[PDB]
Ligand binder design. Structure first.
Ligand SMILES: [Zn+2]
Ligand SMILES: [Zn+2]
Length: 290
């Protein structure tokens, strides 16, 4: 991790949900295209990408090591379990302590039989409008792993729900909330809960920039303005959450660097300063991910 560079707080470089979703677009494995995307990011000052694909989402450590070697970008890999509909059957049968020890080993020993080690517990998720019993179990296991290793936790919210409940659960199990960042806060008008999450001590992410099907970038910007008016940009981080082949520029998509080429300039034009952007893209991630 290079704290002098910009950081994308929630991205995938190799993820394969094509089996779960019966959809080849969800097999993001196009190495040559992704290397070019990483080079594109570097050219605009992004030097860190926090990679959110844990083991059973189709993580590929060797692929990530190869991307770093080809491009020089820093990738922080993760350990964890995703969300209820996607868990392997063994999440149910193994104990909390066993799931925790798995994450600890991925942080301390390495992942996928390589020299690469997990640097964050992520993206650990909850379902839409509820936390299932197995999701609670994963979160409790994540808390244990965080306590043993000190690595921060990055979550998944489904349709921007249950963030406050995730925080309450993690805190109850000894996680200081300054070590938690809540994913996908920008899929709906969500200001009231965002303000409560920031007040509790957590970081929040607008990590679905460009996903306008779900919710317009225009409204993301308005929320960011509300946060800026309140002096809370020091707890906000941004990303694209690239997850699909169709998101890549080589496939006609907007790509990872859309954040810099398109979204940030809209943000600037709407009244943000260079300093405001540096806070969200450099200072916050350097504070949080190290
Ligand atoms: Zn997610
Ligand atoms: Zn993701």
């Amino acid at each position: 991790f290079d704290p002098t560079g910009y950081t994308l707080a929630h991205e995938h470089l190799h993820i394969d949900l094509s089996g779960f979703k019966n959809n080849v677009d969800c097999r993001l494995d196009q190495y040559a295209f992704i290397c070019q995307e990483m080079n594109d990011l570097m050219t605009r000052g992004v030097r860190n990408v926090i990679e959110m694909t844990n083991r059973y989402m189709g993580r590929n450590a060797q692929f990530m090591l190869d991307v770093m070697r080809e491009t020089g970008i820093n990738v922080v890999a993760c350990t964890g379990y995703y969300q209820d509909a996607f868990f392997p059957e063994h999440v149910a049968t193994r104990s909390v302590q066993e799931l925790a020890q798995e994450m600890v080993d991925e942080i301390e020993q390495g992942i996928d039989g390589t020299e690469l080690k997990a640097g964050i517990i992520a993206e650990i998720g909850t379902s839409e409008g509820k936390i299932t019993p197995l999701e609670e179990k994963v979160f409790i296991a994540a808390a244990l792993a965080h306590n043993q290793t000190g690595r921060p936790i990055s979550t998944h919210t489904s349709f921007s729900t249950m963030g406050l409940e995730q925080l309450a659960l993690l805190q109850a199990h000894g996680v200081d909330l300054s070590r938690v960042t809540v994913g996908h806060c920008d899929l709906k008008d969500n200001l009231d809960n965002i303000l409560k999450m920031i007040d509790l001590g957590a970081y929040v992410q607008f990590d679905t920039i460009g996903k306008n099907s779900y919710y317009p970038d225009e409204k993301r910007i308005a929320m960011l303005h509300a946060l800026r008016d309140r002096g809370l940009l020091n707890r906000v981080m941004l990303s694209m959450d690239i997850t699909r082949r169709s998101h890549l520029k080589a496939n006609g998509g907007y790509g990872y660097d859309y954040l810099l080429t398109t979204f940030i300039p809209q943000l600037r034009q709407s009244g943000f300063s260079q300093a405001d952007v540096d806070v969200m893209l450099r200072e916050n991630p350097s504070q949080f991910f190290q």
